[PDB]
RNA sequence: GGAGGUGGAGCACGAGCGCACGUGUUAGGACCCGAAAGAUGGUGAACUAUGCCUGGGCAGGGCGAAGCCAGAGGAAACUCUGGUGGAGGUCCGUAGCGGUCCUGACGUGCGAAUCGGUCGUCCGACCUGGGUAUAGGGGCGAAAGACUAAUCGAACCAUCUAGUAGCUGGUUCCCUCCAAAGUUUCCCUCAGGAUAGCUGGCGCUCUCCGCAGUUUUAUCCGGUAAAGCGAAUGAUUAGAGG
RNA sequence: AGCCUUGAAGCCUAGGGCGCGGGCCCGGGUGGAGCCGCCGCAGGUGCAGAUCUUGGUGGUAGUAGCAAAUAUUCAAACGAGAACUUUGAAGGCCGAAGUGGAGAAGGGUUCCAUGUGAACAGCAGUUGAACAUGGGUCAGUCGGUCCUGAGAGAUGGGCGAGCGCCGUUCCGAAGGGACGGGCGAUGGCCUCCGUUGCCCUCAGCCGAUCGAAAGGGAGUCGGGUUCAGAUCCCCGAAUCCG
RNA sequence: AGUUCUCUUUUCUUUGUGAAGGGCAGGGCGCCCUGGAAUGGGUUCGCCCCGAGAGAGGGGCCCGUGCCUUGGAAAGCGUCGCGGUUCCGGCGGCGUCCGGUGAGCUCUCGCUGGCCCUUGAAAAUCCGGGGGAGAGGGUGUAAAUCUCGCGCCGGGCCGUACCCAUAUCCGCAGCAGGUCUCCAAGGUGAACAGCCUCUGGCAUGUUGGAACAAUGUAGGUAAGGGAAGUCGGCAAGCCGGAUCCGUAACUUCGGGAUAAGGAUUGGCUCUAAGGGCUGGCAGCCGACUUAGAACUGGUGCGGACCAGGGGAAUCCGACUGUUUAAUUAAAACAAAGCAUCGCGAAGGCCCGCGGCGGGUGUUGACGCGAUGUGAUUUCUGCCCAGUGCUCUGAAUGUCAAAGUGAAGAAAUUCAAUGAAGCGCGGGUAAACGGCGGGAGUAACUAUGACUCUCUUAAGGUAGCCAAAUGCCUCGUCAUCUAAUUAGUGACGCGCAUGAAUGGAUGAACGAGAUUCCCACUGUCCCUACCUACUAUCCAGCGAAACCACAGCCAAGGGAACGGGCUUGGCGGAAUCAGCGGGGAAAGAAGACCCUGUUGAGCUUGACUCUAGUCUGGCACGGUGAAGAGACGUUUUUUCACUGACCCGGUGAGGCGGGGGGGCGAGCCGGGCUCUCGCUUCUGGCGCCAAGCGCCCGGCCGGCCGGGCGCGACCCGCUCCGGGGACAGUGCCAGGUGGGGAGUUUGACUGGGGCGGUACACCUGUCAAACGGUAACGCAGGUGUCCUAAGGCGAGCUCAGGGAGGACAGAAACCUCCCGUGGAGCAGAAGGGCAAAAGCUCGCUUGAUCUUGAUUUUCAGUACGAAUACAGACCGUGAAAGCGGGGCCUCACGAUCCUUCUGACCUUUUGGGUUUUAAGCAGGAGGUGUCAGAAAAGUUACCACAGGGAUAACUGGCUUGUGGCGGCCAAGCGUUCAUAGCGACGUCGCUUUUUGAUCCUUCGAUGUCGGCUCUUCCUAUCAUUGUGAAGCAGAAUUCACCAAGCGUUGGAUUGUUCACCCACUAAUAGGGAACGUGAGCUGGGUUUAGACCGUCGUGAGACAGGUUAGUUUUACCCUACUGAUGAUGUGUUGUUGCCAUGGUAAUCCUGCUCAGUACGAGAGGAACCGCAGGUUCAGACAUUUGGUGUAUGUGCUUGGCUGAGGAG
């Protein structure tokens, strides 16, 4: 046989991200003395569309505490922030929408977005449009907090991780039918070469496990074991179940 | 050490070595030409496939979305009527792009895919220039095993390599003499081999008793032709007497 | 003690013969420089075939054909020669999405003048993009040149048997610069200002380099001029940069 | 300048001003000032704007490519006129003027809006601003400084011609192909449409002349009919613009829609309405529209060009989009929608030989990755047994290495322990997939709601159906026709329908498949004519394919279809235009089929491996506490540590500890519990130190200039965090691993496959009286069985029958007699056997050890089996003897390897001892394809070498089957065998049926049917001439001579075949390579795409359905059709004969005979005559029709010649 489309995606080539017109990487501030002890003020200059991303991005500007400079930060835009607004990042920032605080100081039930997976990494979790994480509980003795991720999983993270109060803007995006193959063509022309997708049963056996046959049938169980070799791991990968999810 | 059997490519008063010539069998390119293949290392994205970058391009019409204005109706909700407006992977249709049917032309062509009419689409998932990226068990594929320089169910180039072929084709002067087999057995044996047979050549040991695809005379062997079933086995017709 | 310029090989021959034959001998002609008999030795040693190889030639055959896109005619000139060249006049066509006027890519002298009519231009040619002999491309301002784009690609580092590869800011002491000030050395319009070396002080850019004759990118227009070049030459009038 | 016969103050051409600077129009402003607005106003085509400041005034700025001006009239151009060397930027006159208009086109600037789950580059480079370190001079010849105006110097390098495409480029070429752009006139018109013209360009596309045959290619027309043609309306045709009216079912309410269906359209002369500027009015300007009316022509008017046929339905796919460049444009692919699955980053998925490697990822679950289905609507039932997937695990069978323990001299052996994975138990079908059978039963019959029963993991639910899915099948009913294998609607025990392998539906849409209808028509009846380009002849110029020799037939035989050969017919130069019968014509070593110990693509439950991956061990690999152990050491568990190792961030910017200061708490002003480190209202600013303390320098306490410290706490060993003795990596070990590699996937065979085993053996027969002898010949058997069923001895006699005997009988047990085997001897059969070879007892292990010879198969090899002996040990018998397996003929296995047994055995390499190992000899472990490889599929994407050794056509032999025909005569025919039939039997013929066979062809003979066209046969349907009837007539049946002439139009189907409708004298049957593809067509079959059902895990398959799928060459020879001609008659001509060959006419209707013959009646003829027609043939154009480029004459559209006229 030949290498299947899934295998070919990992080699880069025509399968790399379309990053020509993106505005940069959306991150929190790099943690420094100001955010470790107090807070720093910043002003929202612009809220911009980022190609390939549902959520808008905020362009916040801070004062450099050591030099005569202005620092431009590219934050994830929490819903409700506006241009000209003051945002504050640090340990002693106040619990307002758009402020960046360590999750340790946030009370139980706080809604956050752009939450650091590890302390200092500048924000990794709950960055998709409309999403957020909640704060469940703190363990001051071990300095660790329990949060609920948008997928529903619960995670124990360091209390020192920073995060933005509120939910990511641009929510409810998936509530609109696309209605058109052309509109889906434009959605992915800004992201990557993944569209349109050709079904496995519609290929020949040479380039897919499901291909071939005088009838368009899978011919083998579609739940494939977790340890299947690359080029064989297609279909429902390591599925715990199949069918309609009935109930909770 | 003896006696008697038995296994040995032995002894029993050498015959070998060297060289040359012929024939036969083989190993090698191996009598000559002939595969589909496989391997190593390289050259191609000037066609085409797909992603990206930067440019260019797409008459004239039809329908008439939202929004807006006015008039009328209504207790309210709101309703009706006339305009305005100009949406759309919207319709007719040009450029462009494409290529349905004629199963038309042509079919040693104008052309190793073209030509005519007729046709699809023509603001979009649109068309296109150049730059750039992906390279051969690899790419790329809105998926036809398609496309990857007229080459694709695995490109092209050189080498391995005079690849192997139980299979097809060919195999070059004269005369003289002799002259087959398509059968036995074994073989993943059935288009082929090995094997015995049939052939030829070289002789040698003798001769001027032996032998014979023949009969005769003796003597055995046999269970087919025929015949038998009022004899065994098997099959079978009819009466008759108890 | 072979033959041979008093004519070798080769080649041709309705010449004379020999041999069962493979073949050979002699005569005649052409040719022009070598060759053969016998005893042995040696072999890349004998062709009718292989859709054999290479070269040549037939019949087919003066045959298929020289039929896509409406179309030519009259007079004259040159000339050996005119359906096809040139001029004049008619009749037509392309009909501004052109059969018009200019470019990019590609070509590379095909451009221009004169000459030829051998070969080529599938008839002809007095003609041609053919052949021959000579010419022709002029810039601060039009492009390249510079920038970066998708991307390519060194060093540090890592990997690697190795040619090398990965990687492009990532495991790097990655700056050879600057207003100013201080110490000397020199000079010149030696007056006082330069230059230089060292020291002091200050210093993010964080990625070498490459990447577009359509992207970014200061600044040239009018008139004349050649056989062929001109926003380039000349005339006139301007402008940018240093 | 053109026209001027007439008219035209006419028609044509032409009628400038660059950059840069200045000035001004014009356009724009989300810019300012006054002011304060509802009776809200302003305002655009639309919008939109206002107390966050509208209207109204007055300003400011930006672009000004427009006009004036400097340039600049000197130049350029038009015209007229002079010179010269006359190849002069030659010289002069005049001119280069004044207005209008526009949804006009092209460009450009600007304003404002809509679209995006799309937001639409970077950098070089240039500029402004904030700040104020600094510098500049002391009142002047002023200084630093200047983005102001002039002036001075320089700008190197490379490209630059021309073509830019029916001839400069790529396709071998001056190739009808391909190849990126810019400018873009008048008329008609909606128009960058088509048609004509100006500017500019060209010479008809690599030749001309003359003809006007056939056949073509491309255009036209056609009376009457109108799809009857054909697989199919393919092709052509009808419709078409615009105005006005009008418009259904259905619908997702958007559509359908130009639905459908009508009317109108010219020319000319008018009327009305629709605006601008200036000073309810007056004046002057103007640009195209719309509507209405009269008049008018032979009803012709969208007059050319341009330009939708329509309707009713069914299937499929929602749509737009895409696709096999070069045979498939589709129902296939995609799609939005829907539903699953993995993953929280030390991660999922993937790449990579390699790493602190790489893509997703400039990412973070509203995401990325992997699948299925395929808009909407409605719904998506049951099954977890199978195969997958997944979850739990020391509770826990198997389980590698390593480690631990015991035995031993050690090698080694043994035990204990027990990772993953398998087993075990759950979940899961929008995972692959699946979703029964029999019988009885309701008061006629039929069904059978109901019941019984066997049964699976469910037993097919809602739906739907002879559907693209149903064999039977052309299902049945209805509708559509005259007639329908077609279509539609129903029915449904459905070979083999069915629910995201998605079921049912349904608007719009479709170069998708199908049916009907209206309209239209040359598709057809049934063909004709016309035009252009060929063909044709000529001048010039000029190939190629192909070729053993060649080129007339009949039959024969023959490699079974001859050009050659045999026997006959016969034969006459050289050629022209056509033609497609033949050359089993050319083209290409057949793609079908088979064989090959030849392949390749693909699959998997094939064999052997393998990357990756999961898992255990060892090493890197450390520190401390406890807990549990064992004997201060050491194994293990847990918790911690950091320093290896890893990850994240940062321009490695404030870390740890202490000091110092502020707010609270509290014990009796000080200590502590212990917290804090100065920024949260506003879309400002924020650095390059102020201040203080202490030192030093220069000049004359005063001026000038520096240094240090605090401000800005001190000390520290990892920059700061997060992990961490684990990740991870190196090397081993176990599992998984069609992701990937290599390879295999028997043979025989009346082709192969499927089926059988005729593959190793045995009996009888074949088999032809020695032996041997074949077939997928016939009838059978074998892969075992036996401690006795082997061995010996003795003693008996069996099957069957007859006759007797309590229960007792057909059959129990006892007795007598007969009994040649008719029984038994493991088994198949054949042979053999009677004091035995059978049966019963007694003793036993000759079924033991051993060397040779021989026989059978045979090669005179092996094995296997068997025969005689020989040497030992034995058994049995009194003994002679018999016995080393079975009464004989079958009952089985090499090398290599392993295992056992044997010897005071040999070797174990320098010697010795000992374990081990290897030798020698004899058994066993097995090769059944049985003289003995280790082995699954598919190919329709296919490949090579071959095969006519071998299948799919024709042809050949045969003729069972099919067809046709005789003979006998039981019967039938009321009677009567034979008018006409004819059983039981039997003899033939034919090769238009199917078989059987495999002779020819696999370096190719084009495979069904139709169409067209000719010919032949007779086994005769019709017609002519006849014979016989159970022949009265009429009608019919049987038979003869007989193939001259006929044998038709249609619906359904690809059809052959069939069925029906209709007409007819009749509607016979056949052959010619199942006549006929260089004759066509291509509907079917029979490539590659795709759908459904059944089958398969799958790739894939299906004499199962469905849809789309390239049809090449003649100019050669012959034959044929026509055309010149040739011999030889001295030449030549006119008129003729006819040898030979061809040959043709055919059937029916009406009237009369005649309502007659005949007949009871009903009905009902014939011959002769007359008048017509059908089919066919040969002509012809007077007539009617068709054509018509006489391009003949009118009409007429657009354009062009200034108009008229003429064109
Ligand atoms: Mg496919
Ligand atoms: Mg596969
Ligand atoms: Mg020999
Ligand atoms: Mg040899
Ligand atoms: Mg191989
Ligand atoms: Mg390219
Ligand atoms: Mg459209
Ligand atoms: Mg359209
Ligand atoms: Mg054709
Ligand atoms: Mg042709
Ligand atoms: Mg695209
Ligand atoms: Mg790769
Ligand atoms: Mg396929
Ligand atoms: Mg060879
Ligand atoms: Mg070879
Ligand atoms: Mg063979
Ligand atoms: Mg064998
Ligand atoms: Mg052979
Ligand atoms: Mg016998
Ligand atoms: Mg007999
Ligand atoms: Mg001769
Ligand atoms: Mg010489
Ligand atoms: Mg030699
Ligand atoms: Mg030769
Ligand atoms: Mg000719
Ligand atoms: Mg031509
Ligand atoms: Mg041009
Ligand atoms: Mg030109
Ligand atoms: Mg020529
Ligand atoms: Mg020239
Ligand atoms: Mg590199
Ligand atoms: Mg550069
Ligand atoms: Mg450039
Ligand atoms: Mg440029
Ligand atoms: Mg105002
Ligand atoms: Mg002048
Ligand atoms: Mg300032
Ligand atoms: Mg040029
Ligand atoms: Mg012409
Ligand atoms: Mg010409
Ligand atoms: Mg040409
Ligand atoms: Mg007609
Ligand atoms: Mg008519
Ligand atoms: Mg019909
Ligand atoms: Mg018909
Ligand atoms: Mg048609
Ligand atoms: Mg309709
Ligand atoms: Mg579709
Ligand atoms: Mg595509
Ligand atoms: Mg194709
Ligand atoms: Mg096509
Ligand atoms: Mg699924
Ligand atoms: Mg279901
Ligand atoms: Mg299960
Ligand atoms: Mg089923
Ligand atoms: Mg049902
Ligand atoms: Mg239906
Ligand atoms: Mg039906
Ligand atoms: Mg019909
Ligand atoms: Mg199904
Ligand atoms: Mg000629
Ligand atoms: Mg022949
Ligand atoms: Mg022929
Ligand atoms: Mg062949
Ligand atoms: Mg072949
Ligand atoms: Mg073989
Ligand atoms: Mg293979
Ligand atoms: Mg291969
Ligand atoms: Mg296996
Ligand atoms: Mg595998
Ligand atoms: Mg494989
Ligand atoms: Mg076979
Ligand atoms: Mg005999
Ligand atoms: Mg006895
Ligand atoms: Mg003995
Ligand atoms: Mg016995
Ligand atoms: Mg197939
Ligand atoms: Mg097949
Ligand atoms: Mg044969
Ligand atoms: Mg046959
Ligand atoms: Mg009778
Ligand atoms: Mg035979
Ligand atoms: Mg042949
Ligand atoms: Mg033929
Ligand atoms: Mg042929
Ligand atoms: Mg007859
Ligand atoms: Mg035939
Ligand atoms: Mg033929
Ligand atoms: Mg044909
Ligand atoms: Mg077909
Ligand atoms: Mg097919
Ligand atoms: Mg299945
Ligand atoms: Mg009477
Ligand atoms: Mg007439
Ligand atoms: Mg006129």
* Beta carbons of A92 and A33 less than 8 angstroms apart: no
Both tokens of A48, joined, read 């911009």
Alpha-carbon distance A46 to A127, whole Å? 18
Which experimental approach was used here? cryo-EM
* Beta carbons of A93 and A39 less than 8 angstroms apart: yes
Residue A162 CA to nucleotide D1110 C1', Å?
72
Alpha-carbon distance A23 to A163, whole Å? 21
Separation of CA A10 and ligand 31 centre (Å): 20
Q: How many CB atoms lie within 10 A of CB A186?
A: 11
Residue whose tokens read 């002890």: A37
The answer to whether the C-beta of A197 is closer than 7 A to strand C is no
Length of chain A: 248
Alpha-carbon distance A81 to A209, whole Å? 50
Both tokens of A77, joined, read 């835009």
The answer to whether the C-beta of A20 is closer than 7 A to strand C is yes
Q: How many CB atoms lie within 10 A of CB A172?
A: 9
Phi then psi dihedrals of residue A82, to 5 deg: -135, 165
Helix, coil or strand: residue A13 = helix
Burial letters for A12-51: b for 16+ Cβ neighbours within 10 Å, e otherwise?
eeeeeeeeeeeeeebbbbebeebbeeebbebebeeeeebe
């Amino acid at each position: 046989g030949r290498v299947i489309r899934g295998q070919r995606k990992g080699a880069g080539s025509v399968f790399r991200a379309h990053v020509k017109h993106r505005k940069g990487a959306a991150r929190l501030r790099a943690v420094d003395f100001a955010e470790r002890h107090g807070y720093i003020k910043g002003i929202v200059k612009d809220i911009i569309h980022d190609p390939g991303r549902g959520a808008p991005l905020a362009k916040v500007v801070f004062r450099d505490p050591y030099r005569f400079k202005k620092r431009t930060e590219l934050f994830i835009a929490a819903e409700g922030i506006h241009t000209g607004q003051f945002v504050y990042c640090g340990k002693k920032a106040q619990l307002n929408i758009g402020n960046v605080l360590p999750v340790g100081t946030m009370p139980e039930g706080t809604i956050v977005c752009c939450l650091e997976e590890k302390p200092g990494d500048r924000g990794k979790l709950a960055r998709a449009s409309g999403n957020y994480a909640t704060v469940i509980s703190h363990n001051p003795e071990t300095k660790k907090t329990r949060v609920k991720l948008p997928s529903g999983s619960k995670k124990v993270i360091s209390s020192a991780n920073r995060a933005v109060v509120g939910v990511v803007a641009g929510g409810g995006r998936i509530d609109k039918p696309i209605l058109k193959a052309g509109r889906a063509y434009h959605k992915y022309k800004a992201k990557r070469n993944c569209w349109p997708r050709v079904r496995g049963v519609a290929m020949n056996p040479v380039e897919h496990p499901f291909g071939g046959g005088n009838h368009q049938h899978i011919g083998k169980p579609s739940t494939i074991r977790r340890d299947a070799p690359a080029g064989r791991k297609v279909g429902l990968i390591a599925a715990r179940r199949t069918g309609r999810l009935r109930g909770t």
